[PDB]
């Protein structure tokens, strides 16, 4: 009986949804619940960038030793001036450290655990709502979890205001947890001038900031989506930087991302720099090597960098049309400022569990209880059959 | 000063000791001190079996989504009938748990982070060496850390009475690290009746055997290495089985490995494989593809699987053909039982850390401070050179 006290551990409810999915006769069907993004076809893509690079990589069949535990080098400087820009006053100051990691979920635990064992008594602040993994990580890694305005129910859009008296009242080292930009899962974001402001206080209360870049490339292109972490590292914020590689690589299931941490300088960076290796150590050692050669690949080689690059914004295009085009697809029912105001893979309806039931039962579109819908999973052959649904649902009332 | 507590992380003496067999002028020199497997040229190999699979799911590019959070479904049934055997009757009656981890280190996280949530008050016993990270990992993972007694310093053998009997000491749910075969860094394992009397005091103390299964293959061939876990597994002990690809594939920067818990009954087992995939969730979210479609591909495909095990049984017999060649060099000059006894890639040669300081300084031959041996470093090229090396050490005295 040594494991009669293991409780079994809750079931998927998306898991469910999407086998009710399955299940469901209705040819017209649509499923908008898989927050991953797809094409216009409707499929999970291989970029073209991607597969060259692999074709390339393949004519290399040598041995596979043990990478660094902060990885391989030329991806750490190749995602760190992606994610900074290459001519940041932090890089060239050395106050930067980087290393390679399992996803941006592995960013986020490597950071974690630096920062329960140096800043044990620190205690940390999300967004209202927030990834779905947020809490569960932080929470396991020793954090007590709490939370700070943030969507507006009303608007589908931000209370700042809110979002910033709070924040602003955290003690000393808080650590606050931020989405850089398409906020997952409710699109909405700050702006520029937001940004400069919660800065701001971030920077008067000494406050920890981690930004979770999950999505670089999927709200107005590399560079600007950016804004938050480079603007936090040129003004000298003591920041941790999570970045995902899942979805603007299209290589969710090859597990590759980067952790960067901005310290005060260059000697203090190296400090960090060897403990998050310590992190590493206490948990797989070091990280894998055919992902992040891809990556190192595809970012380096000037050729591959521009076609990756062009198919990331073409993709970043493809999900903007798909806004305006339910945008217009509701206009012809019954604010649907929301479906162009908010940004990213995924948008807030604002539909109630009740409207979400109706959508699924009725008109065989399905989204999540919480109303969160994947843009990206709209295409050509759907937005029109989405939009009315949701037209008709909104239009019936509440 | 965000960051002026965190202090600088230790240099590793390994990779300085490399660094100065790279400056080391000398060409006769001799670098013992990687623990990795290198073929009969010191080559890193490539396994035929693997380039093969490699080349097979080059001509199928297709999407990456992300893998369930134990891993590919292949790979976890593939990797289950090689530990335990295809007609084990834990495997028939699903009393076993087993996930796809990152390298064996990932299996060892993995399970402690499990173990620290549902047994916080059970303490850690290692044996007395061990493999470095062992104490690292499980301290991280807020386990207090004690050893027993295991190396024999005198014999060069085992201490199996004092081991046996400070084992036997331990309080219910003690959690015990044990090596299947192949000790990481002595060499020096247990024989089947040894593994007898000590699973017999196991049972009946009712502590949790942590066993650690890094070179399956590397000591008596597949089956007879991974006696322990599957005779604990037919006895229904409560058993933790950490396996490691890396040495045994040449797979060592791809990470790939498993997890498996043996439980009471099918019951228990999906409840604990749930909490496996909760502190998989809390890390890392799920693992990654490529390695482990190249070791799922390999070990189901019986063309690939034959060719694999037959490599993998050259590369056993060239180690015990190089203990052979050296502990005869040996003979030739100056208890060299030792080096025929202990097995694996590894042996505590009981060479005095000045010894160890002889060896570099004057002969060239670089070992670590400890005494070990890499044995898989050696090869035709340099078999004699060493012997001779050691055999002059040994034979001039302490």
Same mark, same amino acid.
């Given at each position: 009986?040594?494991?009669?006290?293991?409780?079994?551990?809750? *079931?998927?409810?998306?898991?469910?949804? !999407?086998?009710? $999915?399955?299940?469901?006769?209705?040819?017209?069907?649509?499923?908008?619940?898989?927050? &991953?993004?797809?094409?216009?076809?409707?499929?999970?893509?291989?970029?073209?960038?991607?597969?060259?690079?692999?074709?390339?990589?393949?004519?290399?069949?040598?041995?596979?030793?043990?990478?660094?535990?902060?990885?391989?080098?030329?991806?750490?400087?190749?995602?760190?001036?992606?994610?900074?820009?290459?001519?940041?006053?932090?890089?060239?100051?050395?106050? &930067?450290?980087?290393?390679?990691?399992?996803?941006?979920?592995?960013?986020?635990?490597?950071?974690?655990?630096?920062?329960? %064992?140096?800043?044990?008594?620190?205690?940390?602040?999300?967004?209202?709502?927030?990834?779905?993994?947020?809490? $569960?990580?932080?929470?396991?890694?020793?954090?007590?979890?709490?939370?700070?305005?943030?969507?507006?129910?009303?608007?589908?859009?931000?209370? $700042?205001?809110?979002?910033?008296?709070?924040?602003?009242?955290?003690?000393?080292?808080?650590?606050?947890?931020?989405?850089?930009?398409?906020?997952?899962?409710? *699109?909405?974001?700050?702006?520029?001038?937001?940004?400069?402001?919660?800065?701001?206080?971030?920077?008067?209360?000494?406050?920890?900031?981690?930004?979770?870049?999950?999505?670089?490339?999927?709200?107005?292109?590399?560079?600007?989506?950016?804004?938050?972490?480079?603007?936090?590292?040129?003004?000298?914020?003591?920041?941790?930087?999570?970045?995902?590689?899942?979805? !603007?690589?299209?290589?969710?299931?090859?597990?590759?991302?980067?952790?960067?941490?901005?310290?005060?300088?260059?000697?203090?960076?190296?400090?960090?720099?060897?403990?998050?290796? *310590?992190?590493?150590?206490?948990?797989?050692?070091?990280?894998?090597?055919?992902?992040?050669?891809?990556?190192?690949?595809?970012?380096?080689?000037?050729?591959?960098?521009?076609?990756?690059?062009?198919?990331?914004?073409?993709?970043?295009?493809?999900?903007?049309?798909?806004?305006?085009?339910?945008?217009?697809?509701?206009?012809?029912?019954?604010?649907?400022?929301?479906?162009?105001?908010? %940004?990213?893979? $995924?948008?807030?309806?604002?539909?109630?569990?009740?409207?979400?039931?109706?959508? %699924?039962?009725?008109?065989?579109?399905?989204?999540?209880?919480?109303?969160?819908?994947?843009?990206?999973?709209?295409?050509?052959?759907?937005?029109?059959?989405?939009?009315?649904?949701?037209?008709?649902?909104?239009?019936?009332?509440?």
């Amino acid at each position: 009986h040594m494991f009669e006290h293991i409780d079994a551990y809750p *079931g998927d409810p998306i898991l469910t949804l !999407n086998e009710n $999915f399955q299940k469901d006769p209705r040819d017209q069907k649509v499923n908008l619940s898989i927050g &991953i993004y797809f094409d216009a076809e409707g499929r999970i893509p291989v970029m073209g960038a991607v597969r060259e690079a692999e074709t390339a990589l393949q004519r290399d069949s040598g041995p596979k030793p043990y990478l660094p535990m902060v990885g391989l080098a030329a991806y750490r400087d190749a995602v760190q001036s992606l994610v900074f820009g290459a001519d940041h006053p932090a890089r060239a100051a050395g106050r &930067i450290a980087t290393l390679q990691t399992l996803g941006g979920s592995g960013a986020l635990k490597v950071g974690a655990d630096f920062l329960k %064992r140096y800043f044990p008594d620190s205690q940390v602040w999300l967004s209202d709502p927030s990834w779905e993994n947020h809490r $569960f990580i932080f929470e396991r890694a020793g954090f007590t979890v709490n939370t700070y305005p943030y969507y507006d129910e009303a608007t589908g859009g931000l209370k $700042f205001d809110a979002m910033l008296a709070a924040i602003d009242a955290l003690p000393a080292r808080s650590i606050v947890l931020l989405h850089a930009c398409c906020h997952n899962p409710t *699109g909405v974001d700050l702006d520029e001038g937001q940004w400069e402001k919660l800065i701001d206080v971030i920077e008067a209360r000494e406050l920890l900031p981690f930004v979770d870049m999950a999505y670089q490339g999927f709200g107005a292109g590399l560079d600007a989506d950016a804004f938050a972490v480079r603007e936090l590292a040129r003004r000298g914020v003591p920041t941790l930087v999570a970045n995902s590689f899942s979805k !603007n690589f299209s290589l969710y299931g090859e597990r590759v991302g980067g952790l960067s941490v901005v310290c005060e300088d260059a000697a203090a960076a190296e400090r960090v720099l060897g403990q998050l290796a *310590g992190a590493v150590r206490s948990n797989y050692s070091n990280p894998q090597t055919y992902g992040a050669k891809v990556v190192a690949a595809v970012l380096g080689t000037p050729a591959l960098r521009k076609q990756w690059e062009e198919e990331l914004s073409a993709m970043c295009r493809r999900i903007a049309r798909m806004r305006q085009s339910i945008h217009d697809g509701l206009r012809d029912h019954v604010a649907l400022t929301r479906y162009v105001k908010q %940004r990213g893979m $995924f948008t807030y309806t604002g539909l109630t569990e009740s409207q979400v039931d109706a959508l %699924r039962e009725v008109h065989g579109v399905y989204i999540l209880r919480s109303g969160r819908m994947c843009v990206a999973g709209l295409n050509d052959s759907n937005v029109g059959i989405v939009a009315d649904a949701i037209g008709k649902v909104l239009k019936s009332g509440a």
